[PDB]
């Protein structure tokens, strides 16, 4: 039960925005120029780490 | 707390403090020709921008404010007020003229006609851009037609790439054979400049300054006096803009003729080459350590 | 005119074409660097020119090797169309100087030096802005590349044993010149000197660089003595992972 | 207020109709407007002080 | 072996940029005005912490 719960929580954590416009990398890349895109990608990277 | 029990406590650290300061800059006497880049009374087109190389001179950027009626700098890698302290390797100046609503396209990671077919900047650009209105000089009552820009091209342009060839763009399958027929176009349109247009449709003169980071021996930087060299003391040192604190000693490392710096595991500079006398020095932080206090109870 | 012919062959590069990636001193460390390198154990082309239709692509960089002694090779040419519609480089070397110009030259099919007139190389040069003159620069190895409008050249010459094939061991290359050319390059040509014409023969090795990650080993004196290519075989990948 | 729907949008030509300086976009970037595909467009026009 | 590896990793971690222009405090201080410098120093501080 503990292993399944931990894995499920880890998978479910991928839907958080962590303060960004969106939780999908492709949408952020397509909706913004790069220089505005690194600052959005950094929040997601830090949250997942 | 106001009372201390018996034991030994780790309180703080001790460190030796610097004595004086050292500045070491190379031998430069001439002055940079920043005046020629501005007020040139003639600027090239955007599709063929003008490039000038500046090296081996003392640079004083403040006087730049006295040559053109611009408002402020737009620098990316550094700050305009700190340009008088850094020391670079080479300087590049690119001059041209564009429309008013295209100044935003001269920036890293930008998309547009100018950025795709006329002038491209790298994503890691380190420099400044200065644009100012020139409606009084580049406008005629009947319309100026001496400035042109490219509109059609097979593919985009790499950063710092220039295209001069004038051909016939072929949209269709049939060969153009150098005639302006259907599906065949001339990829050069002339800007229409008139004094009655709005502020967004008026000519603008643009100059881009690009700096090279210190990897080779430095050649261009400001007028800072160079002091004497003293060793075997915890001192503050400044070598070509590299500032630090430590003890300088003669070094036994066998530097290659093209090497100017030495690094360590922690990515910290520990070996330097003096700009004036080509000698290798090594830097070691001066003494430091920790202090513990042993006491019985305050009672 | 067309009076020169060429023949091809293939051989193995073994482990050659290593250069210092930066002007930073290091010693007694192992450094991982990603750059443009010549892959280990790759085919390199052996060209025999005897008295040429050079359409040799530039790709992402060129490694050039020469083991001759008579000293007949002089300079190189770079371009994309090699006509008056596009600028092209004219790196030419002689006894006392090296001259680099990038103008709209109209080059011939077979360019060579009369020996010392360039009329057989190009016909005219109208528009250009960049010129350079400097001091001229056993197996000789050269590496040419261009990135973001910067054309960089590395070189190294070393005494060699009496062996036709490439040697076994390591020998690092060093940078000489970086220039702000900032044009498009797709093809390149090599120039030969023919006296007056008298027959001649030459041979050279050509290879192409690729983006690779390497693990270099620095000794206590600061020179590169060993390298590991991380994309050769699983053992090398394991070695790179374990550092 | 004007509603725009069921058409191909080319925003670049907007630069040729008014003598403005630059866009001020919030959710997206002006240079990326030629790739995204939306549901409806609304245009609100008025005049104010400087 | 574990102690040596941990100490070596801790020392090697000091060369990371963590999203800043440079990994050296002196270069950041000399290349920028202060108000642009705190935002660069903060990333390094957070990474080291
Ligand atoms: C700069 O160019 C202008 C062009 O009219 C000229 O009048 C002026 O004398 C030049 N020099 C300075 C210092 O402005
Ligand atoms: C720089 O100038 C000093 C004189 O102040 C001289 O002693 C030194 O040799 C010069 N160095 C170089 C590299 O020109
Ligand atoms: C080089 O090419 C030859 C044939 O042209 C081939 O037999 C050989 O396997 C190739 N070598 C490599 C390393 O691909
Ligand atoms: C080499 O070429 C340069 C420039 O073309 C010339 O000045 C020089 O005299 C030449 N040297 C020889 C030995 O031909
Ligand atoms: C320079 O380029 C222009 C147009 O690109 C061309 O008409 C001209 O013939 C070239 N040469 C000279 C000397 O102007
Ligand atoms: C250079 O020219 C070739 C041939 O026209 C073209 O395919 C290529 O996109 C151009 N640019 C580069 C960077 O190769
Ligand atoms: C390093 O240099 C010293 C001095 O020439 C020499 O004795 C030693 O053998 C060298 N070591 C290596 C590994 O090259």
- Radius of gyration for chain D, computed over Cα atoms and rounded to the nearest angstrom: 12
Which residue in chain C is spatially nearest to B92 when comparing CA positions? Answer: C180
C186 lines ligand 6 (CB under 6 A): yes
Residue B154 contacts C, CB cutoff 8 Å: no
Q: Which residues of B touch C182 (CB under 8 A)?
A: 160-162
Which residue in chain B is spatially nearest to C183 when comparing CA positions? Answer: B161
B276 lines ligand 2 (CB under 6 A): yes
Q: Are A44 and A25 spatial neighbours (Cβ–Cβ below 8 Å)?
A: yes
- D16 alpha-carbon distance from chain centroid: 13
Residue C86 contacts B, CB cutoff 8 Å: yes
The sign of the CA dihedral D9, D11, D14, D20 is positive
Residue C179 burial (C-beta neighbours within 10 Å; 0-12, 13-18, 19+): middle
Residue C84 belongs to what H/E stretch?
Answer: none
What's the rounded Cα separation, in Å, for the pair B233 and B245? Answer: 10
Q: Which of A17, B104, B112 is nearest to D32 (CA)?
A: B112
Span from the CA of C182 to the centroid of ligand 7 (angstroms): 42
What's the rounded Cα separation, in Å, for the pair B233 and C31? Answer: 33
- C91 alpha-carbon distance from chain centroid: 12
Which residue in chain B is spatially nearest to D15 when comparing CA positions? Answer: B101
Residue D19 contacts B, CB cutoff 8 Å: yes
Q: What residues flank ligand 7, with Cβ below 6 Å?
A: C 219-221
- Residue among B27, B28, B275 to mutate when testing ligand 2 (max atoms within 8 A of CB): B27
Span from the CA of E5 to the centroid of ligand 3 (angstroms): 43
Please count the residue pairs, one from chain B and one from chain D, whose beta carbons lie less than 8 angstroms apart.
22
- Radius of gyration for chain C, computed over Cα atoms and rounded to the nearest angstrom: 19
Tokens of B255: 């530097």
Q: Is A40 helix (H, G, I), strand (E, B) or coil?
A: helix
What's the rounded Cα separation, in Å, for the pair A16 and A24? Answer: 10
Which residue in chain B is spatially nearest to C86 when comparing CA positions? Answer: B165
Chain A contact partners (≥3 CB pairs within 8 A): B, D
b/e per residue E14-47 (b: at least 16 CB within 10 A):
eeeebebbebbeebbebbbeeeebeebeebbeee
Q: Are C102 and C92 spatial neighbours (Cβ–Cβ below 8 Å)?
A: no
What's the rounded Cα separation, in Å, for the pair B52 and B35? Answer: 12
Ligand in closest contact with the CA of B40: 1
Instruction: Flag if B123 and A33 touch (Cβ within 8 Å).
Output: no
Which residue in chain A is spatially nearest to B110 when comparing CA positions? Answer: A33
What's the rounded Cα separation, in Å, for the pair C103 and C87? Answer: 5
What's the rounded Cα separation, in Å, for the pair B111 and B271? Answer: 43
Span from the CA of B144 to the centroid of ligand 1 (angstroms): 22
Chain D contact partners (≥3 CB pairs within 8 A): A, B
Q: Which residues contact E43 (CB under 8 A, 6 or more apart)?
A: E17, E18, E19, E20
The alpha-carbon gap from A18 to the nearest alpha carbon of chain B, in Å, equals 25
User: DSSP alpha helices (H): ranges in B44-196?
Assistant: 113
| Alpha-carbon distance values, B256 to B259, C28, C31, C222, C231 (Å) | 5, 16, 18, 9, 30
Q: Which residues contact B219 (CB under 8 A, 6 or more apart)?
A: B26, B28, B55, B56, B57, B88, B89, B90
Q: Which residues of B touch C127 (CB under 8 A)?
A: 164
Which residue's C-alpha comes closest to atom 8 of ligand 7? C221
What's the rounded Cα separation, in Å, for the pair B133 and B136? Answer: 8
Instruction: Flag if B101 and D31 touch (Cβ within 8 Å).
Output: no
What's the rounded Cα separation, in Å, for the pair C44 and C9? Answer: 9
Q: Which of B87, B90, B88, B72 is nearest to B128 (CA)?
A: B72
**Which residue spans within B5-121 are E strands per DSSP?**
7-15, 21-24, 50-54, 57-58, 74-75, 87-88, 91-98
Count Cβ atoms below 10 Å from residue C135 Cβ, excluding itself.
7
Tokens of B23: 């500045």
What's the rounded Cα separation, in Å, for the pair B58 and B223? Answer: 6
Q: Which residues of B touch A34 (CB under 8 A)?
A: 109, 123
Q: What residues flank ligand 3, with Cβ below 6 Å?
A: C 10, 41-43
The sign of the CA dihedral C86, C91, C94, C96 is positive
Q: Which atom of ligand 5 is nearest to the CA of B166?
A: 5
Method: cryo-EM
Which residue's C-alpha comes closest to atom 13 of ligand 6? C184
Q: Are C143 and C125 spatial neighbours (Cβ–Cβ below 8 Å)?
A: no
Phi, psi of D41 (to 5 degrees): -125, 140
Tokens of B104: 């935003």
Instruction: Flag if B263 and C175 touch (Cβ within 8 Å).
Output: no
- Say whether the A–C interface has 3 or more Cβ pairs within 8 Å: no
Residue C235 belongs to what H/E stretch?
Answer: helix C234-242
């Amino acid at each position: 039960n503990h292993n399944a719960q931990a894995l499920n929580t880890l998978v479910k954590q991928l839907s958080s925005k962590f303060g960004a416009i969106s939780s999908v990398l492709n949408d952020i890349l397509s909706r913004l120029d790069p220089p505005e895109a690194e600052v959005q990608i950094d929040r997601l990277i830090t949250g997942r780490l | 707390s106001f009372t201390v029990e018996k034991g030994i406590y780790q309180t703080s650290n001790f460190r030796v403090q610097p004595t004086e300061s050292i500045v070491r800059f190379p031998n430069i006497t001439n002055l940079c020709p920043f005046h020629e880049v501005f007020n040139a009374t003639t600027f090239a087109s955007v599709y063929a921008w003008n490039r000038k190389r500046i090296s081996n001179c003392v640079a004083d950027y403040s006087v730049i404010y006295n040559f053109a009626p611009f408002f402020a700098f737009k620098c990316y890698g550094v700050s305009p007020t700190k340009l008088n302290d850094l020391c670079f390797t080479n300087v590049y100046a690119d001059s041209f003229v564009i429309r008013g609503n295209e100044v935003s396209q001269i920036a890293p990671g930008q998309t547009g006609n100018i950025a795709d077919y006329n002038y491209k900047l790298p994503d890691d650009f380190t420099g400044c851009v200065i644009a100012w209105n020139s409606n009084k000089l580049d406008s005629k009552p009947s319309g100026n037609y001496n400035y042109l820009y490219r509109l059609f091209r097979k593919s985009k342009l790499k950063p710092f790439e220039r295209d001069i060839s004038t051909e016939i763009y072929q949209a269709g399958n049939k060969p153009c054979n150098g005639v302006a027929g259907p599906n065949c176009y001339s990829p050069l349109q002339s800007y229409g400049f008139r004094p009655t247009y709005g502020v967004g449709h008026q000519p603008y003169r643009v100059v881009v300054l690009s700096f090279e980071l210190l990897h080779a021996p430095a050649t261009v930087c400001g007028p800072k006096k160079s002091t004497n060299l003293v060793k075997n003391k915890c001192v503050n040192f400044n070598f070509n803009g590299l500032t630090g604190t430590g003890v300088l000693t003669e070094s036994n490392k066998k530097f290659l003729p093209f090497q100017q710096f030495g690094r360590d595991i922690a990515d910290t500079t520990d070996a330097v080459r003096d700009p004036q006398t080509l000698e290798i020095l090594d830097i070691t932080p001066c003494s430091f350590g920790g202090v513990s206090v042993i006491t019985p109870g305050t009672n | 005119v067309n009076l020169i012919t060429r023949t091809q062959s293939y051989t193995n590069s073994f482990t050659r074409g290593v250069y210092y990636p930066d002007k930073v001193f290091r010693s007694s460390v192992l450094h991982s660097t990603q750059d443009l390198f010549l892959p280990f154990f790759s085919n390199v082309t052996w060209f025999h020119a005897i008295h040429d239709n050079p359409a040799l692509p530039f790709n992402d960089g060129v490694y050039f090797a020469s083991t001759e002694k008579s000293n007949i090779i002089r300079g190189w040419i770079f371009g994309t169309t090699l006509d008056s519609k596009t600028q092209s480089l004219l790196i030419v070397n002689n006894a006392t100087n090296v001259v680099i110009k990038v103008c709209e030259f109209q080059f011939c099919n077979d360019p060579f030096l009369d020996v010392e007139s360039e009329f057989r190389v190009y016909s005219s040069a109208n528009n250009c802005t960049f010129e350079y003159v400097s001091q001229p620069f056993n197996l000789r190895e050269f590496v040419f590349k261009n990135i973001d409008g910067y054309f960089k050249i590395y070189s190294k010459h070393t005494p060699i044993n009496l062996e036709r094939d490439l040697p076994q061991g390591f020998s690092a290359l060093e940078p000489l010149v970086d220039l702000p050319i900032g044009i498009n390059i797709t093809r390149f040509q090599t120039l030969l000197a023919l006296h007056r014409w008298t027959a001649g023969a030459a041979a050279y090795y050509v290879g192409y660089l690729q983006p690779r990650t390497f693990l270099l080993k620095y000794n206590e004196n600061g020179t590169i003595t060993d390298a590991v290519d991380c994309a050769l075989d699983p053992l090398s990948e394991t070695k790179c992972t374990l550092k």
